Design a binder for this molecule. Structure first.
Ligand SMILES: [Mg+2]
Ligand SMILES: [Mg+2]
Ligand SMILES: [Mg+2]
Ligand SMILES: [Mg+2]
Ligand SMILES: [Mg+2]
Ligand SMILES: [Mg+2]
Ligand SMILES: [Mg+2]
Ligand SMILES: [Mg+2]
Ligand SMILES: [Mg+2]
Ligand SMILES: [Mg+2]
Ligand SMILES: [Mg+2]
Ligand SMILES: [Mg+2]
Ligand SMILES: [Mg+2]
Ligand SMILES: [Mg+2]
Ligand SMILES: [Mg+2]
Ligand SMILES: [Mg+2]
Ligand SMILES: [Mg+2]
Ligand SMILES: [Mg+2]
Ligand SMILES: [Mg+2]
Ligand SMILES: [Mg+2]
Ligand SMILES: [Mg+2]
Ligand SMILES: [Mg+2]
Ligand SMILES: [Mg+2]
Ligand SMILES: [Mg+2]
Ligand SMILES: [Mg+2]
Ligand SMILES: [Mg+2]
Ligand SMILES: [Mg+2]
Ligand SMILES: [Mg+2]
Ligand SMILES: [Mg+2]
Ligand SMILES: [Mg+2]
Ligand SMILES: [Mg+2]
Ligand SMILES: [Mg+2]
Ligand SMILES: [Mg+2]
Ligand SMILES: [Mg+2]
Ligand SMILES: [Mg+2]
Ligand SMILES: [Mg+2]
Ligand SMILES: [Mg+2]
Ligand SMILES: [Mg+2]
Ligand SMILES: [Mg+2]
Ligand SMILES: [Mg+2]
Ligand SMILES: [Mg+2]
Ligand SMILES: [Mg+2]
Ligand SMILES: [Mg+2]
Ligand SMILES: [Mg+2]
Ligand SMILES: [Mg+2]
Ligand SMILES: [Mg+2]
Ligand SMILES: [Mg+2]
Ligand SMILES: [Mg+2]
Ligand SMILES: [Mg+2]
Ligand SMILES: [Mg+2]
Ligand SMILES: [Mg+2]
Lengths: 61, 204, 134, 50, 153, 135
RNA sequence: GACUCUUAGCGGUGGAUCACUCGGCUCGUGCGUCGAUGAAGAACGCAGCUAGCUGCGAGAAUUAAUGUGAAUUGCAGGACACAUUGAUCAUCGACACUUCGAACGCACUUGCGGCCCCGGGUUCCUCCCGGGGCUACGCCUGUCUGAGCGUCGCU
RNA sequence: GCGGUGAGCCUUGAAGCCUAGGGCGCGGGCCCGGGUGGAGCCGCCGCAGGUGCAGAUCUUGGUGGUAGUAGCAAAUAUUCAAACGAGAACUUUGAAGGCCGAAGUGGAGAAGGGUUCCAUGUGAACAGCAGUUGAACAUGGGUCAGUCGGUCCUGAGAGAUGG
RNA sequence: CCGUCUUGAAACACGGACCAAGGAGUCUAACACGUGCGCGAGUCGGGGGCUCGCACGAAAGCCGCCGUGGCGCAAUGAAGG
RNA sequence: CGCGACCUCAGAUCAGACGUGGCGACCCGCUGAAUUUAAGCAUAUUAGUCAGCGGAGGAGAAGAAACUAACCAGGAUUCCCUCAGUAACGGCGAGUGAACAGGGAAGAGCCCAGCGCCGAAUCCCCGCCCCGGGGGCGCGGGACAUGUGGCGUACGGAAGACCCGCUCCCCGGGGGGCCCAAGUCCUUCUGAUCGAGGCCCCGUGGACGGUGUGAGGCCGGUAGCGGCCCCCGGGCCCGGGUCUUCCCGGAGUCGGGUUGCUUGGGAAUGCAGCCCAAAGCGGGUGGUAAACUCCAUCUAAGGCUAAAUACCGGCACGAGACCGAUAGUCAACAAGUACCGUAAGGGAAAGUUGAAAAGAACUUUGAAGAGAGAGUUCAAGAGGGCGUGAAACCGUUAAGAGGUAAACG
């Protein structure tokens, strides 16, 4: 554990890590899009959402 | 339902008539007690049963709405008669009046102490003691099937709105609580016999 | 009646979760009442039995007012051994007769830091209950 | 035979280490329900798979 | 064999049917599961009217049903033009455009313009920033009547 | 066409099934092309394909593939949909433009065979027996 | 008196009946998660006394951590004052995880390599021994090194 | 088996089973006494069935008669004494008499078996009589290689890559 | 001397040594008529929806011309009708 | 006669990545029988089914009309009820057999290519520099004019003027742990009692379980919108209305022939092969082949998409008018186990001492197994395959009888 924790500190922030240091989670979960390119939106899509946002309304009876 | 595969997950063939055994199918192979012994029939040990119970039996019945409403009216009208209520076995020999109507302070009760004290003053408490006397074990295989204890049916409190009336009883053995807007023939005539003793609130 | 749809009521499932229950759950199952002096000295009604409690038997053949020290808690069989609940076998040697801890009553507790803090915890939770009598 | 491969000799080593009686202290465990080694093999009667 | 008198029956059971039987024993389970998703959606959209947008008046399309009238998929672009509201703001208001619906007649055009104008006077539009009302509604209007509408609009 | 793979032409039983020679395959030759490129290049994703000339014997197709793990593709919305796991080997589930046409999808009266979403989905629905609770 | 037959009492043989039930079956709900970071599966191994089952991987009937708070138990053993700070069980996020297996240097009812680094005998010299690391196919982007009586330019 | 109902029955003895005991019913069957047993059971009103057996060369399990019968007869053969032992036609030692008769009933291997090998101990089962014997049971032990094989080579052939 | 098939079985027709236990007209759909019930020129929610928080309750209640629809209230002609 | 561009194409244990196998209840794509029924059988039927092959997901597929209609018109997909055993198919026999409208559940819409304009305005890689990918640099590489990005897609769009309206939008409850009411009161049964009397106590808790029978009150729990504890849930930036001038679309595809399968699809519903092979006021559809002509309808040959829907596998729960050890899964147990077969594969039997081991000390006969006493226990008529212990069958005692085999009315 002391050896492995030293290696985790050595590669703290380097570009490439050993495969046994980088996280395991699940083979399918390692293939999914990460959190930055998951919510990339085009300019045609993000112009529509400033011009036409969903409004908060109510309808009286 | 029984399993769809039960009695059929064996390989079995009839032997024919050269052998001096019956023409039932027989388990194949060798080397165990199972080999060459009868299979697939309803008379064979470890075989399929006859006409295996399917899951699409018609379990449910529909009754017409006018017929269900007329069972209610016939059940409410049978519980205003002291002969039919007593013949159902209730202890109403000291009950002041049928139908018994108590007033709407009852619907806001909270504790079981004030609940039991209400039934003693209305002389509806000997009917609860016939429930305590009748607590016994069921006879039969129901005890393996989570139906171990059986008891008498007692009174039926009928209310208009809940303001605490459900929590206040709920713990007295054999007390059914019906909302008056949603009456039920399974609880106003248990066993199919008319005349459950019912206690009404004034708003109900 | 039970209203939680997540706890079961099934006879064969409650027996199964009792007969092979892990040994730290068996410790709670093998609880015992306190004496009338110790229920009002503390506020606790019942407490899981410990190696060196002093206790007396209230049911069975060894019923009496003799105080015996617990000498072994045999959680594998749900049974406890008390110093003078004995019989001799054919050899002349003497074995302890195990009795279920629901049939004894703790006449003094064997206190330490852990059995104090779980004995103040069981006293606090009643005081939250006795303020709701309004 | 006397000429055997290594992975057969090791297969035959496992089958004669499990060819053994039950210990006598097993029978005194709580919730025993076992009384002899029911799957004991004899070299003359029941041959191996191999 | 036919016995004496009766129908010539032709029962459709020659095709291994009991492998494909849809029982319905989860029917009250799914009436509860659907109902818990109506109640959950209706509190996600908290003053928005629990049932979705307004729907037009649509005449039913055959000779058997053209005396009755129902609700359609949405308002046509010609109804949106002469009620004077943009086709891309209207879903943000709860109107549900239908872009492929023609208007052949005039009094069915006018009955949905009249439905749209009567809706637009009736809905209460909260501002984007509640600290600064731009054009939406008066803050007194949003207090004693900001309730969610149940059933269809 | 598709020669039936039966030894010496002896299909067995019932002369409606005696056919060996003049039989045809259900998917098209273009769809067979898109499958063969997708099985070889398993790490790529088949987008679409087109025709570049025949022969009497052969027929040539160019197949557009996409590497789903290049960051010119994962960092572009409106093409990062093909990086989802539900689009793996989409030429073998039959849903590129070439293999879609053999399925009989479409709207209208000419396409009642697939009115649940495939031929097997329609057939399954109109051959289950709905046994309600209150029959 | 034997034998035989009938009936009863008692004794066997046998395991029906009955009672029991940590098991199924059926319906419903909620989740809906494998793998080159070596999966499923298989093999062999592992306990003081231990064969099977079960658990586990040469750290091998388990290590750490956290919650728990005095056992485990068939026998023995020595623990752990329960704060000179923790028995046991549970949880499990840290660490470990033999060989085969998509199975990855090549091969397999067997065995033989190649490359680089380190150690030992050497006392850089690379022969021997040990150790470590890499050495499969397909494919993409990029790089490097090329090939062409392919298309050309300048000479 | 389920809904009801009998202020039902029961460790002061339920079910079950047995019975030269008492009776009832045309019968299906039932009630009571006695014995055994050791924890649950039954009556009425409805409800629901995987609801009643002599047969199917029926299925599975048990058991008879046959019957202490058929049998324990292929390849010439045993005998005396002693020892151990609770016990000897069968073990061991000696003595005799014999057989295989070197294409062996001898001495070693290949396949195949898998510990049977070898000691000591047992004396239940098993070795179709019996055993003091065993290839059984228990407890221990035992297979050592530069040179003997595998390993290497190709054979009939099997088999990827390019296609 | 029983079961069985048969014009005909005590049969020199077949099956049955003996005992226990298991062992064979079921369930779904569609019809037909008969009977019981409710409503009645109508009838029926079966699907969906609404209702303290799901012990029982996966039940029960309610909707409104939600009556959409089914069957019934009109026949005949191949069809225009 | 070399040097250099590019184009085609090689080799690397090149730098960084990715695919392969499993499971497969449900889902998609293919391939695809024969038993069977027709009282024979060959078309039909079984059946687009079983088996076979491939590929997925937590759902999948489908999906924003080349649609339905013919009406006063509806308006993506999917599912339910109905349409309907109907139109239609069919040795017009057996048999098969949908759709549209109506009612519900759910509801959500969009994106390119092209045509064009914007000084390629675009993307990847590397190096350095600031935050835990962001941001900023690089006379740093490369992709790319054989076309990246913005605007923009049939619901039209753009560019101009003209009128008008402004201050934006995005991003940085669940899980686990410990606790919480009230009789071991008196009397009497019993081997023990949770029994039976008596006097209760808690109740928002009288579900169930354990405990030496049968327990609201002994113990764990149960009830409670009960408690405490721990853990998880800077970017970016105008819009609308009118008017003029322009801009407008997917080809070996449609379609036709013919062959084969398929379908309710009938002079051809879909799909495929092969030959022929387009058009632009065109093309498709308008359920009888054809010519002619009005009218309606939609815009094929590119793409994305939640919900409602399915689920005999998995993880984890809950329940039952179910079964009760020859039943229920093959498997209540050292069960896919022992064993059988070269292999593919086949495949059992087997639950119960007692509350507690108190599991019979000791004496005595025997070589031992086995007995006789003695002892444990409420009980060994519970003695280690032991609850109860039926019958067939057997031994023994008792009673009765016996040459037409017994048995029976
Ligand atoms: Mg764009
Ligand atoms: Mg019974
Ligand atoms: Mg042999
Ligand atoms: Mg809705
Ligand atoms: Mg045919
Ligand atoms: Mg086509
Ligand atoms: Mg006798
Ligand atoms: Mg038994
Ligand atoms: Mg039954
Ligand atoms: Mg019988
Ligand atoms: Mg003889
Ligand atoms: Mg001779
Ligand atoms: Mg020899
Ligand atoms: Mg020899
Ligand atoms: Mg013998
Ligand atoms: Mg020997
Ligand atoms: Mg005759
Ligand atoms: Mg006869
Ligand atoms: Mg004769
Ligand atoms: Mg015959
Ligand atoms: Mg016979
Ligand atoms: Mg029977
Ligand atoms: Mg009738
Ligand atoms: Mg795969
Ligand atoms: Mg036929
Ligand atoms: Mg026939
Ligand atoms: Mg025939
Ligand atoms: Mg077919
Ligand atoms: Mg298949
Ligand atoms: Mg999809
Ligand atoms: Mg539609
Ligand atoms: Mg009809
Ligand atoms: Mg068909
Ligand atoms: Mg462009
Ligand atoms: Mg308590
Ligand atoms: Mg109890
Ligand atoms: Mg209890
Ligand atoms: Mg057909
Ligand atoms: Mg026509
Ligand atoms: Mg799609
Ligand atoms: Mg059994
Ligand atoms: Mg048995
Ligand atoms: Mg069984
Ligand atoms: Mg039994
Ligand atoms: Mg007894
Ligand atoms: Mg007994
Ligand atoms: Mg018993
Ligand atoms: Mg027994
Ligand atoms: Mg018992
Ligand atoms: Mg017995
Ligand atoms: Mg006599």
């Amino acid at each position: 554990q002391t050896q492995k924790e030293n290696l985790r500190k050595f590669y703290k922030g380097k570009k490439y890590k050993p495969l046994d240091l980088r996280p395991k989670k699940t083979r399918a979960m390692r293939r999914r899009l990460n959190k930055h390119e998951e919510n990339l939106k085009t300019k045609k899509q993000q112009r529509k959402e400033r011009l036409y946002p969903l409004r908060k309304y109510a309808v009286k009876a | 339902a029984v399993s769809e595969l039960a009695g059929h997950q064996t390989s079995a063939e009839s032997w024919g008539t050269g052998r001096a055994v019956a023409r039932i199918p027989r388990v194949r192979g060798g080397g165990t007690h199972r080999s060459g012994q009868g299979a697939f029939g309803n008379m064979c040990r470890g075989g399929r049963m006859f006409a295996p119970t399917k899951t699409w039996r018609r379990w449910h019945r529909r009754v017409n709405t006018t017929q269900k409403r007329y069972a209610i009216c016939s059940a409410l009208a049978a519980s205003a008669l002291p002969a039919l209520v007593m013949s159902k076995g209730h202890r109403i020999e000291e009950v002041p009046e049928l139908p018994l109507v108590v007033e709407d302070k009852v619907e806001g009760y909270k504790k079981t102490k004030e609940a039991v004290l209400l039934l003693k003053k209305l002389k509806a408490w000997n009917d609860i003691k016939k429930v305590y006397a009748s607590q016994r074990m069921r006879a039969g295989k129901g005890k393996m099937r989570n139906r171990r204890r059986i008891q008498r049916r007692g009174p039926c409190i009928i209310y208009n709105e809940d303001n605490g009336i459900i929590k206040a009883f709920r713990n007295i053995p054999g007390i059914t609580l019906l909302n008056v807007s949603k009456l039920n023939i399974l609880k106003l005539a248990p066993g199919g016999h008319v005349g459950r003793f019912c206690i009404w609130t004034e708003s109900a | 009646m039970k209203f939680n749809p997540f706890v079961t009521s099934d006879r064969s499932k409650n027996r199964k979760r009792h007969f092979n229950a892990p040994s730290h759950i068996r410790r709670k199952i093998m609880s015992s009442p306190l004496s009338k002096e110790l229920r009002q000295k503390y506020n606790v009604r019942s407490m899981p039995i410990r190696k060196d409690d002093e206790v007396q038997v209230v049911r069975g053949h060894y019923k009496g007012q003799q105080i015996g020290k617990v000498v072994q808690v045999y959680r594998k069989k749900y049974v406890i051994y008390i110093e003078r609940v004995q019989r001799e076998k054919a050899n002349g040697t003497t074995v302890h007769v195990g009795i279920h801890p629901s049939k004894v009553v703790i006449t003094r507790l064997k206190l330490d830091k852990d059995r104090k803090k779980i004995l103040e915890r069981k006293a606090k939770s009643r005081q939250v209950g006795k303020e709701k009598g309004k | 035979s006397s000429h055997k491969t290594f992975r057969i000799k090791r297969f035959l080593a496992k089958k004669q280490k499990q060819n053994r009686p039950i210990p006598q202290w097993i029978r005194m465990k709580t919730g025993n329900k076992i009384r002899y080694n029911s799957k004991r093999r004899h070299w003359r009667r029941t041959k191996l798979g191999l | 064999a036919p016995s004496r008198n009766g129908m010539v029956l032709k029962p459709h059971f020659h095709k291994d049917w009991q492998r494909r039987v849809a029982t319905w024993f989860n029917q009250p389970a799914r009436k509860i599961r659907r109902r818990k998703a109506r109640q959950a959606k209706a509190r996600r959209i908290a003053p928005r009217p629990a049932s979705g947008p307004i729907r037009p008046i649509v005449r039913c399309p055959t000779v058997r049903y053209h005396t009755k009238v129902r609700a359609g998929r949405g308002f046509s672009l010609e109804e949106l033009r002469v009620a004077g509201i943009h086709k891309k703001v209207a879903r943000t208001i709860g109107i549900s455009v239908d872009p492929r619906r023609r208007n052949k007649s005039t009094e069915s055009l006018q009955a949905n313009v009249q439905r749209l104008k009567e809706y637009r006077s009736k809905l209460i539009l909260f501002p984007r920033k509640p600290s600064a009302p731009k054009k939406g509604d008066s803050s007194a209007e949003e207090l004693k009547l900001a309730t969610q509408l149940t059933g269809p609009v | 066409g598709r020669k039936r793979p039966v030894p010496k032409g002896a299909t067995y039983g019932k002369p409606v099934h005696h056919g060996v020679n003049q039989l045809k395959f259900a998917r098209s030759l273009q769809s067979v092309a898109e499958e063969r490129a997708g099985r070889h290049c398993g790490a790529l994703r088949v987008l679409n394909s087109y025709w570049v000339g025949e022969d009497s014997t052969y027929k040539f197709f160019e197949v557009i593939l996409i590497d789903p793990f290049h960051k010119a593709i994962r960092r572009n919305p409106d093409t990062q949909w093909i990086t989802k796991p539900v689009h793996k080997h989409r030429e073998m589930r039959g849903l590129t433009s070439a293999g879609r046409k053999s399925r009989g999808l479409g709207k209208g009266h000419k396409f009642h065979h697939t009115i649940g979403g495939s031929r097997r989905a329609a057939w399954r629905r109109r051959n289950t027996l709905q046994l309600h609770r209150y029959r």
